[PDB]
Design a protein around this nucleic acid. Structure first.
Lengths: 32, 122, 118, 113, 54, 214
RNA sequence: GUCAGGUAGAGAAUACUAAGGCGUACGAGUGAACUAUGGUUAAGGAACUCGGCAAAAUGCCCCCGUAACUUCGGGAGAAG
RNA sequence: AAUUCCUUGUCGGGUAAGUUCCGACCUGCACGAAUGGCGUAACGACUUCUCAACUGUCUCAACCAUAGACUCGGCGAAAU
RNA sequence: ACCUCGAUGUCGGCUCGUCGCAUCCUGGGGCUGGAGCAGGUCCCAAGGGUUGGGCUGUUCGCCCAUUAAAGCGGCACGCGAGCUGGGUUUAGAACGUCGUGAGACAGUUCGGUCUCUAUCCGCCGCGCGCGUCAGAAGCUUGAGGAAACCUGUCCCUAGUACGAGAGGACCGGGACGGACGAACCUCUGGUAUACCAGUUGUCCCACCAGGGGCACGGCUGGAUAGCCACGUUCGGACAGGAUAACCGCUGAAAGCAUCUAAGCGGGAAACCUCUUCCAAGACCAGGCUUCUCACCCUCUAGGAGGGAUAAGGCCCCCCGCAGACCACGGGAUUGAUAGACCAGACCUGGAAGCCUAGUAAUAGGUGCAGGGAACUGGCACUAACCGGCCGAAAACUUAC
């Protein structure tokens, strides 16, 4: 990948984790 | 001095034959477990018709150690193998018979049932 | 005697054990040898131990010296002249005198004797 | 002969029987359990003795229920009221660490007739 | 690691002045009826004759 | 307020308790002292007592020192030190020429022993500061014990005074606290402190009542 | 390229040594850190790490006994 | 899969836990029959995974001896 | 596309840190759809702490066991003249796809040299010189700094408060721990190149016996001192001052109310004292006190130069558990500082010679024998010497 998106995949995967961490916090708002 | 990854010979009759220590309970980042310290183990070897089968996480207490252990009098006790007795969550043996002598130190740590079933408490 | 604290004299412990015997074999033969200053200080406790063996001369002490010096003409001198000479003086049979250094390496240099005063 | 002698002289404990490595002995160690006091006899051979005067130390090796135990005591300890040598061993060492790998008949010590 | 720059005139002299010698302390010896000066270390050897006076 | 005395560390030994336990004790020869000087506020601005200890032949004392002891009326000693009190309510019970003994302490009194620890010479970081080395295998190149990195890179541009590296270690004054006196042997003037006190056999120690548990 | 002592040994391997030849050309010291090359290690035994890299272990002669598979020779010094 | 991007595909085995590994599915981005296809006993200082023994690789380092390092006398450089 | 292409070495990991607070734990509170236990949300707070493993080169992530907690970031996405080199990113070779071809990849796979003697600043240690209004010495005050600051479980209180049950406390006491650090070596362990014993191969001391050299100290079994940790003991306390968020009392402007404008109080691991350490080069160079408290010569006498001394120190010498050298500490004949000698402790374990029994390997007696270093106590026998070099005062102004 000379275009160098092989580093963006771990940037894109991380964004999925942070967005997942968003929803579980909202799962704490309604449950409480 | 039994730590993580150590293998101990089970002195019970639960059907286990040898365990591998997973963790030493007692505090955060604790290293060694002597006579009377509770470990978390995995059964690496069991008899065929056994009650407990290999590959399950179970809790146990050391009863013998190879490294000599001090006593407040200034005298020492030292066995010739590391051994453990599988206990449940209320500090009582899962097995019904204990094999070989055990250390006196289980008395002051409130392992009352293990001490009574042992052949010789030293 | 108490072992050498630092590195040994001849570049190895095996060499020093053979170097300290040759210096004692030559002290009892001539009576005064001149050598390097740290070689003289290391020889002095080594040499006075053998002369004690000479004083209490028995077959046992003849064999104890013979396992160090390995020579058979010095060990006769050690058990016929040196021993009986110091039959009364208690310890301190040698003296160390400091002399002018060498030239090629400026090493400290001393001469070591046998006490012949009494 | 040491500088600290006066301090250790009072604590010294007499009437210790003369025993050396190889002897079989039984030590009457006191034990406390549930406020009760009794004695427990530990019988085995003496495999070590590390002199210090008051700091003297000897160990007794026993094979019990298929497991070999050892137990190190101070010679002048007050938790020991009796030491009774039984037999006289006939050995050639002074520290008997070779007994730690012999089981059964091979671990029998000779007797000093 | 090489010297980055030429060392100044003053900077080399100040350090070079520390590379010096030390004159020994001599002591009078009366051997062979003529007074000489030897270091006090060699005092006993000069009277016995073990040291030569060039 | 706080008692104190100058003594020398004899060695270590062991003695047994009343429950037949074992207590590793250190023997200190808290030999007799004298009071050679007393420091009041209206002269020196603080309150303390100056103590003398040791035995020295009077031909070994510098003349300035030999005159200082004559101004108090005592024979010369080797070591002169000072116990720092806090007010005149404590100073008033000392007096020049008075002699202190080991009997000022009792059994079970908590003491603080000070002395100069042993020397270890030029010691590297792995021993002095308790660092780690790099691995002993897996390719490490002559780096098995040296400290490693030092600082940042072009910003700090320097080394931040107080960092830890190799140097001469040990041989400095250190004070251990709350050591329990096991027994005071008044006949020989010997204290039996339980534990371990700084210095070497034959050094010089000062035992004082514990500042925390006294 | 040619000679090839003795004792252990299957051996021209290896240990010591005879005849013979050398001590080969900077030294003297001193228990600093650190580096390199050797040595030992309590309890645990791959938890280290990219990876059992490096060390450690196995190691000889004589008997006993040796699996799957197979191109029928092997595997095989299997393993023990 | 030395070929599969999505991908750490899905199921099973091994492990306390296995993006690696073995078996199988077929939805083959972008296998395929002398640029040979599919297998194969023996062989490999090839590459990948698992186990017994073993150990300073590690938990966690400690100590000893030699060659430098350090001190003294002699000769006496280099890149910059 | 502004600095660098007559070179600013690029991802992870290791070692080592330092800072911010937008706080994961511990500390203090306000509100609650807060009964209790436990939560939710916001405010104050950076002192300390924040684990080990399976998969991947992996940052990241998922998982296994725990824990009070397993924080987020900056410092060339800290740190390669500190280490690695698994990945990326040279040359070899192969698979898929692209191209007629040399070749290519936005894809994959196996392999692939990590250079340098520190000049300057910086940092950790250690010296020499001069100064502190005479020359020395003993003991100290502290301006200013450095270090440390973590926390859990169980038992009473009490099955009490709360609740209708299930469940289950605040506050206040007591015991035992985890991790980290410092000192020490009595104990337990580790090491032992001049300790003791066993023993293989070989050469030698004429031979036997007894020993020695070499083979990693040849290899084995132990091993006092020293150094250590896996060992032993101790530490992070109690109290105070000023405060944050927050709670208030007395009170007007504004006949009432208001914690605020005048005043007065409570209040946390943060701050200042409290504990340990350095520290008068603290240039305001400090304080208490004690010793020496003294001679000569020359320039043209204004001052200077030179010489010789005291108190004291240095060098030489014997050394140290002090140490790279230097430094520090002890001793120097009026002498126990080192070695030797005598004795003890400890280590090894039953010496040589002789006698006896056996055909012999070998065993028993003489005998807790012999050998031996570091620890302790004695003894001037050996060496600390019929010794050199440094090292002390212009005065004046004012008050008294």
């Amino acid at each position: 990948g000379e275009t160098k998106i092989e580093t963006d995949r771990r940037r894109i995967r991380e964004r999925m984790a942070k967005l997942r961490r968003e929803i579980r916090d909202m799962k704490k708002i309604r449950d409480t | 001095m039994i730590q993580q990854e150590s293998r101990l010979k089970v002195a019970d009759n639960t059907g286990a034959k040898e365990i591998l220590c997973i963790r030493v309970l007692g505090g955060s980042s604790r290293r060694y477990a002597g006579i009377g310290d509770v470990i978390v183990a995995t059964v690496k070897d069991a008899i065929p018709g056994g009650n407990v089968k290999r590959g399950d996480v179970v809790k146990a207490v050391v009863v013998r150690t190879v490294k000599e252990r001090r006593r407040a009098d200034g005298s020492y006790i030292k066995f010739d193998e590391n051994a453990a007795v599988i206990i449940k969550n209320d500090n009582d043996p899962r097995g019904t018979r204990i094999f070989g002598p055990v250390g006196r130190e289980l008395r002051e740590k409130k392992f009352m049932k293990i001490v009574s079933l042992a052949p010789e408490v030293l | 005697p108490k072992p050498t604290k630092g590195p040994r004299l001849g570049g190895s412990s095996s060499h020093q054990s053979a170097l300290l015997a040759n210096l004692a074999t030559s002290l009892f033969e001539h009576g005064r040898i001149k050598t390097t200053e740290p070689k003289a200080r290391a020889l002095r406790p080594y040499a006075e131990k053998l002369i004690t063996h000479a004083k209490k001369g028995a077959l046992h002490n003849r064999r104890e010296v013979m396992k160090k010096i390995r020579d058979k003409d010095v060990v006769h001198t050690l058990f016929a002249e040196i021993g009986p000479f110091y039959a009364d003086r208690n310890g301190g049979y040698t003296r160390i005198i400091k002399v002018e250094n060498r030239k090629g390496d400026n090493a400290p240099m001393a001469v070591i004797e046998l006490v012949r005063e009494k | 002969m040491n500088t600290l002698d006066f301090v250790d002289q009072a604590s010294l404990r007499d009437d210790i029987p003369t025993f050396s490595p190889g002897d079989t002995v039984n030590v009457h160690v006191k034990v406390i359990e549930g406020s009760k006091e009794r004695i427990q006899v530990f019988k085995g051979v003496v495999i070590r003795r590390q002199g210090g005067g008051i700091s003297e130390t000897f160990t007794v090796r026993k094979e019990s229920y298929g497991v070999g135990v050892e137990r190190t005591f101070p010679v002048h300890s007050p938790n020991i009221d009796h030491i009774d040598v039984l037999t006289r061993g006939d050995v050639r060492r002074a520290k008997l660490y070779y007994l730690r790998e012999l089981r059964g008949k091979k671990a029998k010590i000779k007797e000093k007739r | 690691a090489v010297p980055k720059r030429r060392m100044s005139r003053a900077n080399t002299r100040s350090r070079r002045a520390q590379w010096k010698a030390e004159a020994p302390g001599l002591v009078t010896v009366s051997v062979a009826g003529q007074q000489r000066k030897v270091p006090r270390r060699l005092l006993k050897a000069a009277r016995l004759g073990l040291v030569d006076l060039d | 307020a706080r008692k104190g005395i100058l003594g020398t560390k004899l060695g270590m030994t062991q003695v047994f308790d009343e429950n037949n336990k074992v207590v590793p004790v250190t023997v200190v020869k808290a030999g007799p002292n004298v009071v050679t000087r007393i420091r009041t506020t209206e002269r020196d601005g603080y309150s303390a007592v100056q103590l003398a200890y040791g035995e020295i032949s009077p031909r070994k004392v510098i003349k300035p020192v030999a005159g200082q002891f004559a101004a108090a009326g005592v024979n010369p000693r080797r070591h002169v030190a000072e116990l720092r009190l806090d007010d005149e309510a404590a100073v008033a019970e000392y007096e020049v020429g008075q002699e202190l003994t080991a009997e000022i302490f009792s059994d079970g009194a908590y003491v603080d022993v000070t002395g100069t620890s042993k020397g270890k010479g030029f010691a590297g970081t792995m021993k002095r500061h308790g660092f780690r080395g790099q691995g002993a295998a897996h390719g490490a190149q002559a780096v098995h014990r040296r400290p490693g990195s030092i600082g940042g890179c072009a910003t700090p541009g320097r080394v931040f005074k107080g960092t830890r590296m190799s140097g001469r270690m040990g041989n400095d004054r250190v004070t251990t606290q709350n050591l329990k006196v096991h027994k005071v042997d008044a006949e020989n003037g010997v204290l039996l402190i339980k534990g371990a006190i700084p210095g070497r056999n034959g050094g010089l120690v000062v035992v004082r009542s514990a500042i925390k548990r006294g």
